[PDB]
Scaffold this active site. Structure first.
Site, PDB file in Angstrom:
ATOM      1  N   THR A 112     -61.745   1.537 -28.406  1.00 21.60           N
ATOM      2  CA  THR A 112     -62.115   2.855 -27.916  1.00 21.60           C
ATOM      3  C   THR A 112     -62.538   3.787 -29.041  1.00 21.60           C
ATOM      4  O   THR A 112     -62.682   4.991 -28.813  1.00 21.60           O
ATOM      5  CB  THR A 112     -60.956   3.473 -27.133  1.00 21.60           C
TER       6      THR A 112
ATOM      7  N   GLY B 252     -56.246   9.642 -34.654  1.00 19.53           N
ATOM      8  CA  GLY B 252     -55.899  10.396 -35.845  1.00 19.53           C
ATOM      9  C   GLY B 252     -54.553  11.077 -35.715  1.00 19.53           C
ATOM     10  O   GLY B 252     -53.762  11.090 -36.660  1.00 19.53           O
ATOM     11  N   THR B 253     -54.248  11.598 -34.527  1.00 20.08           N
ATOM     12  CA  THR B 253     -52.940  12.199 -34.344  1.00 20.08           C
ATOM     13  C   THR B 253     -51.824  11.156 -34.418  1.00 20.08           C
ATOM     14  O   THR B 253     -51.024  11.145 -35.376  1.00 20.08           O
ATOM     15  CB  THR B 253     -52.885  13.035 -33.072  1.00 20.08           C
TER      16      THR B 253
ATOM     17  N   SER C 249     -49.818   5.368 -31.826  1.00 20.68           N
ATOM     18  CA  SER C 249     -50.948   4.453 -31.856  1.00 20.68           C
ATOM     19  C   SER C 249     -51.548   4.406 -33.255  1.00 20.68           C
ATOM     20  O   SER C 249     -51.415   5.344 -34.044  1.00 20.68           O
ATOM     21  CB  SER C 249     -52.029   4.865 -30.849  1.00 20.68           C
TER      22      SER C 249
ATOM     23  N   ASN D 187     -54.022  -3.495 -26.518  1.00 22.48           N
ATOM     24  CA  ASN D 187     -54.192  -3.335 -25.079  1.00 22.48           C
ATOM     25  C   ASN D 187     -54.743  -4.597 -24.428  1.00 22.48           C
ATOM     26  O   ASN D 187     -54.307  -4.958 -23.331  1.00 22.48           O
ATOM     27  CB  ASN D 187     -55.100  -2.139 -24.794  1.00 22.48           C
TER      28      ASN D 187
ATOM     29  N   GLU E  88     -27.336  -5.328 -34.417  1.00 24.84           N
ATOM     30  CA  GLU E  88     -27.181  -6.775 -34.278  1.00 24.84           C
ATOM     31  C   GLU E  88     -28.531  -7.485 -34.261  1.00 24.84           C
ATOM     32  O   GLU E  88     -28.761  -8.427 -35.035  1.00 24.84           O
ATOM     33  CB  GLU E  88     -26.392  -7.084 -33.006  1.00 24.84           C
TER      34      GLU E  88
HETATM   35  N1  LIG Z   1     -51.136   1.851 -24.199  1.00 23.97           N
HETATM   36  C1  LIG Z   1     -51.627   3.086 -24.211  1.00 23.97           C
HETATM   37  N2  LIG Z   1     -52.487   3.485 -25.215  1.00 23.97           N
HETATM   38  C2  LIG Z   1     -52.994   4.744 -25.221  1.00 23.97           C
HETATM   39  C3  LIG Z   1     -52.651   5.642 -24.222  1.00 23.97           C
HETATM   40  N3  LIG Z   1     -53.281   6.810 -24.473  1.00 23.97           N
HETATM   41  C4  LIG Z   1     -54.011   6.673 -25.603  1.00 23.97           C
HETATM   42  N4  LIG Z   1     -53.848   5.397 -26.074  1.00 23.97           N
HETATM   43  C5  LIG Z   1     -54.454   4.827 -27.289  1.00 23.97           C
HETATM   44  O1  LIG Z   1     -54.594   5.840 -28.265  1.00 23.97           O
HETATM   45  C6  LIG Z   1     -55.830   5.726 -28.939  1.00 23.97           C
HETATM   46  C7  LIG Z   1     -56.377   7.099 -29.321  1.00 23.97           C
HETATM   47  O2  LIG Z   1     -55.335   7.995 -29.643  1.00 23.97           O
HETATM   48  P1  LIG Z   1     -54.743   8.954 -28.497  1.00 23.97           P
HETATM   49  O3  LIG Z   1     -53.380   8.474 -28.062  1.00 23.97           O
HETATM   50  O4  LIG Z   1     -55.699   9.004 -27.333  1.00 23.97           O
HETATM   51  O5  LIG Z   1     -54.640  10.411 -29.161  1.00 23.97           O
HETATM   52  P2  LIG Z   1     -53.696  10.703 -30.426  1.00 23.97           P
HETATM   53  O6  LIG Z   1     -52.683   9.604 -30.639  1.00 23.97           O
HETATM   54  O7  LIG Z   1     -53.021  12.023 -30.157  1.00 23.97           O
HETATM   55  O8  LIG Z   1     -54.699  10.801 -31.683  1.00 23.97           O
HETATM   56  P3  LIG Z   1     -55.991  11.758 -31.639  1.00 23.97           P
HETATM   57  O9  LIG Z   1     -56.946  11.247 -30.592  1.00 23.97           O
HETATM   58  O10 LIG Z   1     -56.674  11.772 -32.987  1.00 23.97           O
HETATM   59  O11 LIG Z   1     -55.550  13.155 -31.278  1.00 23.97           O
HETATM   60  C8  LIG Z   1     -56.758   4.998 -27.981  1.00 23.97           C
HETATM   61  O12 LIG Z   1     -57.533   4.050 -28.676  1.00 23.97           O
HETATM   62  C9  LIG Z   1     -55.848   4.302 -26.990  1.00 23.97           C
HETATM   63  O13 LIG Z   1     -55.892   2.907 -27.177  1.00 23.97           O
HETATM   64  C10 LIG Z   1     -51.784   5.247 -23.214  1.00 23.97           C
HETATM   65  O14 LIG Z   1     -51.475   6.030 -22.324  1.00 23.97           O
HETATM   66  N5  LIG Z   1     -51.275   3.967 -23.211  1.00 23.97           N
HETATM   67  N1  LIG Z   2     -15.284 -18.574 -26.595  1.00 17.03           N
HETATM   68  C1  LIG Z   2     -15.666 -17.281 -26.466  1.00 17.03           C
HETATM   69  N2  LIG Z   2     -16.500 -16.756 -27.398  1.00 17.03           N
HETATM   70  C2  LIG Z   2     -16.913 -15.471 -27.314  1.00 17.03           C
HETATM   71  C3  LIG Z   2     -16.442 -14.646 -26.196  1.00 17.03           C
HETATM   72  N3  LIG Z   2     -16.995 -13.430 -26.356  1.00 17.03           N
HETATM   73  C4  LIG Z   2     -17.753 -13.472 -27.481  1.00 17.03           C
HETATM   74  N4  LIG Z   2     -17.703 -14.691 -28.047  1.00 17.03           N
HETATM   75  C5  LIG Z   2     -18.398 -15.107 -29.287  1.00 17.03           C
HETATM   76  O1  LIG Z   2     -18.348 -14.055 -30.249  1.00 17.03           O
HETATM   77  C6  LIG Z   2     -19.579 -13.995 -30.968  1.00 17.03           C
HETATM   78  C7  LIG Z   2     -19.939 -12.537 -31.209  1.00 17.03           C
HETATM   79  O2  LIG Z   2     -18.839 -11.957 -31.896  1.00 17.03           O
HETATM   80  P1  LIG Z   2     -18.892 -10.455 -32.461  1.00 17.03           P
HETATM   81  O3  LIG Z   2     -18.872  -9.450 -31.337  1.00 17.03           O
HETATM   82  O4  LIG Z   2     -20.091 -10.252 -33.355  1.00 17.03           O
HETATM   83  O5  LIG Z   2     -17.529 -10.397 -33.304  1.00 17.03           O
HETATM   84  P2  LIG Z   2     -17.134  -9.088 -34.143  1.00 17.03           P
HETATM   85  O6  LIG Z   2     -18.239  -8.751 -35.113  1.00 17.03           O
HETATM   86  O7  LIG Z   2     -15.867  -9.395 -34.898  1.00 17.03           O
HETATM   87  O8  LIG Z   2     -16.909  -7.930 -33.204  1.00 17.03           O
HETATM   88  C8  LIG Z   2     -20.621 -14.720 -30.137  1.00 17.03           C
HETATM   89  O9  LIG Z   2     -21.251 -15.720 -30.940  1.00 17.03           O
HETATM   90  C9  LIG Z   2     -19.864 -15.383 -29.007  1.00 17.03           C
HETATM   91  O10 LIG Z   2     -20.104 -16.792 -29.014  1.00 17.03           O
HETATM   92  C10 LIG Z   2     -15.534 -15.290 -25.219  1.00 17.03           C
HETATM   93  O11 LIG Z   2     -15.091 -14.658 -24.239  1.00 17.03           O
HETATM   94  N5  LIG Z   2     -15.202 -16.572 -25.420  1.00 17.03           N
HETATM   95 MG   LIG Z   3     -55.485  12.234 -29.383  1.00 20.30          MG
END
Ligand SMILES: Nc1nc2c(ncn2[C@@H]2O[C@H](COP(=O)(O)OP(=O)(O)OP(=O)(O)O)[C@@H](O)[C@H]2O)c(=O)[nH]1
Ligand SMILES: Nc1nc2c(ncn2[C@@H]2O[C@H](COP(=O)(O)OP(=O)(O)O)[C@@H](O)[C@H]2O)c(=O)[nH]1
Ligand SMILES: [Mg+2]
Ligand SMILES: Nc1nc2c(ncn2[C@@H]2O[C@H](COP(=O)(O)OP(=O)(O)OP(=O)(O)O)[C@@H](O)[C@H]2O)c(=O)[nH]1
Ligand SMILES: Nc1nc2c(ncn2[C@@H]2O[C@H](COP(=O)(O)OP(=O)(O)O)[C@@H](O)[C@H]2O)c(=O)[nH]1
Ligand SMILES: [Mg+2]
Lengths: 97, 428, 428, 426, 426
Positions: free
Chosen positions: D169, D134-135, D130, D196, D244
């Site tokens: 927060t 601070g952490t 995040s 969030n 890719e």
């Molecule tokens: N999406 C999400 N955000 C979280 C979660 N827990 C904490 N946060 C975010 O983290 C921010 C604060 O940091 P924390 O994750 O609580 O703790 P930390 O990353 O260890 O940093 P410190 O608090 O300084 O120890 C908050 O503002 C939250 O928005 C979570 O479970 N999900």
């Molecule tokens: N006509 C046809 N095209 C295919 C098929 N499978 C993959 N492709 C084409 O191959 C491209 C991806 O090739 P890629 O895996 O990167 O080739 P490589 O880098 O030589 O391994 C995509 O744009 C697809 O359109 C197939 O079964 N038929």
């Molecule tokens: Mg924390």
């Protein structure tokens, strides 16, 4: 007969998976039948993208109708009487010919 | 060899074309499956005219079904002969025209003309020797009346020598279902005069009048109306498909018809129409066919030929007959009603015989004729179109498509020039 | 394929939605949960779980109206996100719904229409339903057209709404909202379906024998109207008529998009017992001034366009015969600039019956959409009343305190003088 | 064989690691003891046939890790892996970077050294902390600084809480936040800044839970990390490794701050009533109201987009959705990226924990856009830190800890230069 | 006698070749074990072209599967015919390039050539008379685009006279999955023009266009795409493996296909793809093959030939026909579309006949051709690479490898010189 043989072969190959398709439906419909609707939609879709009635003369073939600019919407049947044709013979006796 | 490609435009055209593809399927002994179940060898000798070969002893109609609305095809496909047509020949889209000639002809048709042109060229290069195409549509629509004109203009440039016959449906003034119907009609007939070898004017109200009176049908649907037009136009090419006592073709009729290129609108006629009570007291004879045909009630146009002068007459017959009565009746009708025939051309009647009778019927006849009655339709449209344009009503629909206003005038100017020179042919 | 999206505005809009969608559930066959024990895609949408979801946006500015739907029988039929509510309403104030309260929920509704437009591939048009009386149905409704017009320039915007009844009224400050809403239904509408409840009140009591009707009885009849419009779209017919077909053949000028509707037959089961129903009989009731759903007499005006929707067991033969009889009536006047003003539409499926309704089960039905100039007198009564209000400067402090300029009142009042004048020009 | 080692720091690191590890255990079927009644990228086998999480929980307060030590997964976890301190920094970057770090820097370094010895081919170091504590700030800074010289080439992913623009927060959070950014600039490969408040709004709006908690947030953090690692864990038609999608995300050494998005996120009751398909889910990934960082990309311009589908999905629908989103004028791209997508597909649908909130859904999407719209949050922090440092509040704490006060102005100028560089790209 | 060694580069190349080796194993009647269960004597007559003999009536593919990451080898042997390949032929490294052309070509390229070249030389000294090797790779990767260029250059020095075909995969601009894709394609085509006898330009997008429209598949996976690309190159060498009325091989076409050495890029074509509904209404005829052949939608490259002039056409037919129809259809299409054909070469079409029909089908046809439309692709890449290279974007990944800056300039100069002389030949 060579193309006639292949015609019967197409009937043969379309059948065999229908057994394999059917036995899953009977196995899946062992507890409740409330939930077998997508199978019934799947096995009644028909051979090819067709909506109208099947043609028993040609072997249930459903030809598609996809010519609409770049969209190609399939033609749906609005459903009607679909009465048997005149033959030109029914009217000729109706008109006394 | 001698092949025909069916162009199919509009809900009107799709339904009548589906009806037409059924009668000749019955005639040529073709099941809805697609194979051949016929008995006579002549039932399958010239089936390549309308059908193309498919593997497994199957034949496919050489049709190109077009409409701007997708739901018409599903009615065509759900039809009993719906599994007889190849799906790739079906061309359509999701955006319609809304009875607007302008939208079909310019705005939305321009995106679909390419694909149908691919289909017709595919069917054109299939057959070795094509006699011509065949389009059926309605002048009261937005697709057949609309982009259907655009399809005709292109293929005349691509294939000038090939014949282009049109069983077009002209709207009726007494019964109509569209207010911009004169607008589409006035912008369609100008496309007809410039690019069409021959046209047949069928009016639904005249068809409605026949089953009101001639057939006495209590509830005839449009399928009955589809039944007459298919039977009428099957009699045009019955001599083509089957040999007769005196053979003829579409080019045999058209070359023997058209005196000047500006006149290619005609009224068709059909012989074997009787009600159920009429079957009890009748005798199938040559004069009865001729007697029924020259009565103005039988005709499927809204013009009375007794008000005009019959320019030329073509009368083809279906079934095995003698030419004693055929010539004696045409000579008798030529001399008796002399005032209705022009004096500049003697022997206006053209005759042809086809040995093969229609299926399930013994005797038949079909007739195509040019008379001075046809402007009863055209000028009556001008009584509407001009009386709708001076206040610029319903114009923003047409103006919003991006075209000018001079086009309505020039189409009107062509139509007034069309009748005026053709007026002069009446008093000549 | 064809799809319709409902954007009903107001408590009335919520209530007609409840009536329309119950009817929509009955025709296709949706259970109250939403499973069948593609005619439904135009209104419903498939889910992953195979649920068929209504494609309507219920929007309201008060919670109580939409919360009743949330606890109704169809609670598990509607998506809860779809039913959009508001914490505060306008309380018969256009200004609050157009400048203060609407802006909080403009985006959230506008994200919904986009998401509903996402689900549909080909969108036909938009059904927007509201009322001219209530503040949300006038204020919030007026803004949303202004924004969806620039979001979807081409997409159709239908407008069934409720006009204030010329004698009975549920509000006193209604003409201020009604006048200030007329600007939006002019430059942001494609069609309009103004109706006073009083005309429905007279028709139901006179015909359906319900001497004590409720609002649901009225909403059942309006649901029949919307069902008849989409019926050719949902099911097949001899003459399928889409939305764009009769938009074109009803609107002569961009400033004229206010037809009048009429539904027939409307008769009780005991009433239906003694009377034959035929096409000529049921169509004749559509031209009766006492059966009109708007308090005006078209006999005082002239039709320039009539749209005709046959439904049920109908035949094209009786279609043309009924048209023939009506054209031979001096009481029915037509404008000099439309000789063919009938737009025929034919469907197969008869209208279904809701249990607990008022209409009996019938085999055939007709729907009427006539544009006429006799509607303009109704706006004059609003101009007669609202102007005598506005000179007294009453209720002005309410709207001015919201934050809109008082000069827009005069402009909106000045506008309707021009709309009434334009209808007089066609009357010449 | 691909291996990702967890280096979680702080209270946030410990809670997030416990979250992510219950999702890894339920995904791989491992019982709470560590026995199975794919996995090798996170677990490691032992002589007793147990599976060993490759995680280093480090904290300066005992109780946060003793809760895990007496938790359910006590026998699953290593007593030596869990590294605790006796006294914290108490939201002091100076304490966390200069006074308390050096006591256990060596122990933490030795622990990750033995974990890297256990691993054969190391793919990445996923480091969670995040910017407020601070952490989670100073210790993260110093371990990035030493880890950069310990492994020059090994990639270091940086998942970290950023202070929310409205709610907070702490009061002394911006000093730690401005002083930490040097390490996420010059000692990081990718950074996944999270506040969030955005997740708070998301879980209230979509998930219908009116009273959520930190474990509800940690569920979605574990979900997005799991969707990131799903291509390494299981098979896909287009597997996407770390190299890719960092290569197709980072154009310049100074620009490694993409914004993330998860879709679909709907409760089960509402999930009853809608279709979930590729177009709808990729449209939901683009809404500004669903963005997990409080900024509008519509105010900026996208110049890269990594894309990770998951579950029942077809590349046909993927390409259709790409076409649909490209045909949109509200979505902008910089002139030097006509093609700015990095598409990957995985087979296995995202699993579900009991007691969680998201319903089980057959197809999901994770979006990672590098844009220029993030710099406005740094600008807000710059204004707040400027009006902090104007009156020299709380300076005495850090000065007594023993850092040089010019480093504050140096960090302010450095973040101003970063914002200027983002302007040059924009 | 005439043997082909199947080089295999990249994830795209590995999946393509795996589908390919299954397809001809079906054609030659070879079981997953490796023995022969076939019926016709011709099914085992020239199988030594691609297979090598083993005791027990066993046959092994002559393929060298090369990729920079071991994560794809598992899926290679997890497939149906995964155990038919010899394990010693699998050559791969530990760390991939991450779609970086620089890393694959120079840094992690240097140590893996020796294992590849030793395996390649071992198969080279196995067969007595080699017609030429065969390599499939992708131009958007890090190994196939990168490493894939390097082994071609060395084997040209080692084996100059042998035929060198490459079924490379050119990235698409409308649908792209890599941001550094133009940089890899910039530095790979320069290696293609200098050292390659012929190249086949495939594109996944146009393959996606075909399955949506021509086949109307609801859920097309990459196996379906691999089915098509294996079928066309099966049609290239079917005349080699089986006798025909008019015989041909690679050198029959390649000599007849290269008017000038700088031009070796071709777009292929396969005649009978029809949807299941299209099976119902057709008549199998040679004109129907030719009609579907020249329809611009049938090409699976990203260039419409109707904007270009046609240099040289190939038409190889698989099965039993009569050539009077074949010659009449070639003559019919030559005269009708006269504008699209070059005038300094009358009779632009080369025809070949292979008597053995493809398995499960009666009739098919394969098509190779060089037209002016292919130059539409190269400048289309140039519009994106120059947009990247003007701001020195994504350069530090390349610049960190160790090359200088002029290599992009000379690669840009080479293809600009390529298209300029290509435009002059129009
Ligand atoms: N999406 C999400 N955000 C979280 C979660 N827990 C904490 N946060 C975010 O983290 C921010 C604060 O940091 P924390 O994750 O609580 O703790 P930390 O990353 O260890 O940093 P410190 O608090 O300084 O120890 C908050 O503002 C939250 O928005 C979570 O479970 N999900
Ligand atoms: N006509 C046809 N095209 C295919 C098929 N499978 C993959 N492709 C084409 O191959 C491209 C991806 O090739 P890629 O895996 O990167 O080739 P490589 O880098 O030589 O391994 C995509 O744009 C697809 O359109 C197939 O079964 N038929
Ligand atoms: Mg924390
Ligand atoms: N046809 C019909 N009209 C209704 C119905 N309910 C209300 N109205 C009309 O709507 C007007 C009032 O608007 P409401 O819909 O009740 O309320 P609102 O549109 O949300 O506007 P506020 O009252 O300001 O919130 C009344 O004067 C009625 O004429 C109904 O159920 N059916
Ligand atoms: N005779 C006849 N006319 C029909 C039939 N179906 C439709 N119509 C006529 O066609 C007109 C509508 O055609 P429309 O669908 O707009 O043609 P489109 O615009 O070309 O598709 C109506 O006026 C009908 O009278 C039919 O089966 N028979
Ligand atoms: Mg209200």
């Amino acid at each position: 007969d060579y193309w006639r043989l292949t015609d019967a072969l197409t009937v043969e190959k379309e059948k065999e998976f229908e057994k394999y398709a059917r036995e899953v439906i009977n196995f899946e419909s062992e507890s409740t039948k409330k939930y077998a609707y997508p199978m019934v939609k799947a096995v009644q879709e028909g051979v090819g993208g067709g909506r109208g009635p099947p043609f028993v003369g040609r072997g249930g073939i459903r030809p598609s109708y996809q010519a609409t600019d770049a969209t190609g919407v399939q033609l749906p049947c609005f459903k009607s009487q679909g009465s048997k044709y005149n033959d030109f013979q029914k009217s000729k006796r109706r008109l006394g010919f | 060899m001698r092949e025909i490609v069916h162009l199919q435009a509009g809900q009107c055209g799709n339904q009548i074309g589906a009806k037409f593809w059924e009668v000749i399927s019955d005639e040529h002994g073709i099941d809805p499956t697609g194979t051949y179940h016929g008995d006579s060898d002549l039932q399958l000798e010239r089936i390549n005219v309308y059908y193309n070969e498919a593997t497994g002893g199957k034949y496919v109609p050489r049709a190109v079904l077009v409409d701007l609305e997708p739901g018409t095809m599903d009615s065509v496909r759900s039809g009993p002969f719906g599994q007889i047509f190849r799906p790739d020949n079906f061309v359509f889209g999701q955006s319609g025209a809304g009875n607007n000639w302008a939208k079909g002809h310019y705005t939305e048709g321009a995106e679909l003309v390419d694909s149908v042109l691919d289909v017709v060229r595919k069917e054109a290069e299939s057959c070795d020797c094509l006699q011509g195409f065949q389009l059926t549509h309605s002048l009261g629509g937005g697709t057949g009346s609309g982009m259907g004109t655009l399809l005709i203009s292109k293929i005349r440039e691509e294939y000038p020598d090939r014949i282009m016959n049109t069983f077009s449906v002209v709207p009726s003034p007494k019964v109509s279902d569209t207010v911009v119907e004169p607008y589409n009609a006035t912008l369609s007939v100008h496309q007809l005069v410039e690019n069409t070898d021959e046209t047949y004017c069928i009016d639904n109200e005249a068809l409605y009048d026949i089953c009101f009176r001639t057939l006495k049908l209590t509830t005839p649907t449009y399928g009955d109306l589809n039944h007459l037009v298919s039977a009428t136009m099957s009699g045009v090419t019955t001599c083509l498909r089957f040999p007769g006592q005196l053979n003829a073709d579409l080019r045999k009729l058209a070359v023997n018809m058209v005196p000047f290129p500006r006149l290619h609108f005609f009224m068709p006629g059909f012989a074997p129409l009787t009600s159920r009570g009429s079957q009890q007291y009748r005798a199938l004879t040559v004069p009865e066919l001729t007697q029924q045909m020259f009565d103005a009630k039988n005709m499927m146009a809204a013009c009375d030929p007794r008000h005009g002068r019959y320019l030329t007459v073509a009368a083809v017959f279906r079934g095995r007959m003698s030419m004693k009565e055929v010539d004696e009746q045409m000579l008798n009708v030529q001399n008796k009603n002399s005032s209705y025939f022009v004096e500049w051309i003697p022997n206006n009647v053209k005759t042809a015989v086809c040995d093969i009778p229609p299926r399930g019927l013994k005797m038949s006849a079909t007739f195509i004729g040019n008379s001075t009655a046809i402007q009863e339709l055209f000028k009556r449209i001008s009584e509407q179109f001009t009386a709708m344009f001076r206040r610029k009503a319903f114009l923003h629909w047409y103006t919003g498509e991006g075209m000018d206003e001079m086009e309505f005038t020039e189409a009107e100017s062509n139509m007034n020039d069309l009748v005026s020179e053709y007026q002069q042919y009446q008093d000549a | 394929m064809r799809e319709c999206i409902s954007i009903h505005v107001g408590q009335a809009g919520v209530q007609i939605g409840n009536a329309c969608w119950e009817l929509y559930c009955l025709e296709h066959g949706i259970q109250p949960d939403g499973q069948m024990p593609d005619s439904f895609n135009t209104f419903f949408s498939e889910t992953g779980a195979g649920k068929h979801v209504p494609r309507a946006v219920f929007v309201d500015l008060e919670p109580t109206v939409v919360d009743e739907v949330r606890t109704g029988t169809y609670r598990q039929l509607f998506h809860p996100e779809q039913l959009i509510t508001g914490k505060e309403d306008a309380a018969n104030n256009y200004a609050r719904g157009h400048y203060t309260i609407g802006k909080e929920i403009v985006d959230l509704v506008l994200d919904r229409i986009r998401k509903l437009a996402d689900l549909c591939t080909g969108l036909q048009g938009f059904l927007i339903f509201h009322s001219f009386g209530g503040g949300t149905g006038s204020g919030f409704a007026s803004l949303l057209m202004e924004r969806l017009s620039v979001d979807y320039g081409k997409k159709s915007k239908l407008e069934f709404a409720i006009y204030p009844a010329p004698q009975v009224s549920t509000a006193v400050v209604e003409p201020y909202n009604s006048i200030l809403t007329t600007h939006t239904t002019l430059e942001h509408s494609d069609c309009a379906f103004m109706v006073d409840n009083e005309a429905i009140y007279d028709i139901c009591r006179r015909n359906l024998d319900i001497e004590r009707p409720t609002y649901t009885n009225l909403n059942r009849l309006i649901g029949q109207i919307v069902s008849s419009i989409t019926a050719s779209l949902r099911f097949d017919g001899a003459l399928n008529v889409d939305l764009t077909e009769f938009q074109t053949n009803l609107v002569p000028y961009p400033r004229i998009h206010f037809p009048l509707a009429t539904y027939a037959p409307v008769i009780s089961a005991e009433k239906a017992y003694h009377e034959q129903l035929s096409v000529a009989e049921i169509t004749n009731a559509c031209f009766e001034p006492a059966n009109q759903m708007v308090k005006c007499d078209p006999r005082h005006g002239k039709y320039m366009a009539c749209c005709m929707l046959y439904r049920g067991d109908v035949v094209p033969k009786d279609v043309n015969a009924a048209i023939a009889t009506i054209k031979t009536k001096r009481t029915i006047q037509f404008v000099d600039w439309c000789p063919t003003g009938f737009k025929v539409g034919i469907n197969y499926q008869p209208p279904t019956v809701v249990p607990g309704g008022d209409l009996a089960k019938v085999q055939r039905a007709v729907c009427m959409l006539s544009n006429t100039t006799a509607i303009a007198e109704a706006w004059a009564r609003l101009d007669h009343k609202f102007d005598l209000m506005y000179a007294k400067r009453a209720f002005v402090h309410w709207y001015v305190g919201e934050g809109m300029e008082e000069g827009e009142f005069s402009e909106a009042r000045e506008d309707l003088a021009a709309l009434e004048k334009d209808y007089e020009e066609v009357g010449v």
